[PDB]
Design a protein around this ligand. Structure first.
Ligand code: URF
Ligand code: CA
Ligand code: MN
Length: 237
């Protein structure tokens, strides 16, 4: 049923399902088997930052992930998102753990979307920026194990009081309002997403990752989408 486009920060290589032999970024059209990837030098415990972009002229989805003091990693993939995704969509952040685990912690998240038409002065827009997550955050649809307000943060995966991550966990956060990505009289459509995070683990091998995703508006966590499926897909096809 559900329909997914996402940019994965895969902290654990499941090389039997096409993950490279290390931590990587990647771009998932309707399949966790990333159509493109590139190497990611994840840093256990540092605050990393993620920049997603597309426009309907270039029909290319490109992302850049960047720790301070450090080189960025970038990946891109040419796709017409209008030939993939429904005309109305919800955007979100997903992450997960299996028998390996990490903190999956959003410190900030900031979407922008524009439709500009043939007409004079006719942009249509939605921005949001969260630098501080509330306990009762009514503009976010929290799903599965995702919680807010903990040091004013979004906790995609489960954490215990003391402050360390639980395995076999999946959670997502979706912005309450739909996003129009296409309109008949569109001449350029665009979107960018930024978000910062703190993946952290007591282990040399953390799993599984964080995705920023764009989905149908009724999208929900598919069964057994813990671990390698990142809360996005029900299987690995
Ligand atoms: O891309 C968008 N344009 C206008 C809107 F109101 C919205 O939610 N999304
Ligand atoms: Ca993986
Ligand atoms: Mn991958």
């Amino acid at each position: 049923a559900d329909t997914i486009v996402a940019v994965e920060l895969d902290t654990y290589p499941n090389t039997d399902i096409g993950d490279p032999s290390y931590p990587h970024i990647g771009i998932d059209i309707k399949s966790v088997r990333s159509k493109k990837t590139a190497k990611w030098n994840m840093q256990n415990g540092k605050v990393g930052t993620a920049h997603i972009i597309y426009n309907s002229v270039d029909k290319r989805l490109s992302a850049v992930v960047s720790y301070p003091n450090a080189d960025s990693a970038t990946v891109s993939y040419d796709v017409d998102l209008d030939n993939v995704l429904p005309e109305w969509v919800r955007v979100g952040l997903s992450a997960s753990t299996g028998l390996y685990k990490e903190t999956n912690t959003i410190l900030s998240w900031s979407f922008t979307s524009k439709l500009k038409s043939n007409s004079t002065h006719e942009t249509n827009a939605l921005h949001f920026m969260f630098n501080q997550f509330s306990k009762d955050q009514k503009d976010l649809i929290l799903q599965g194990d995702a919680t807010t307000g903990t040091d004013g943060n979004l906790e995609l995966t489960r954490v215990s009081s003391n402050g360390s991550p639980q395995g076999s966990s999946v959670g997502r956060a979706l912005f309450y309002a739909p996003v129009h990505i296409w309109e008949s009289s569109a001449v350029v459509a665009s979107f960018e997403a930024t978000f910062t995070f703190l993946i952290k683990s007591p282990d040399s091998h953390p799993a599984d990752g964080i995705a920023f995703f764009i989905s149908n508006i009724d999208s929900s966590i598919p069964s057994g989408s813990t671990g390698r499926l990142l809360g996005l897909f029900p299987d690995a096809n």
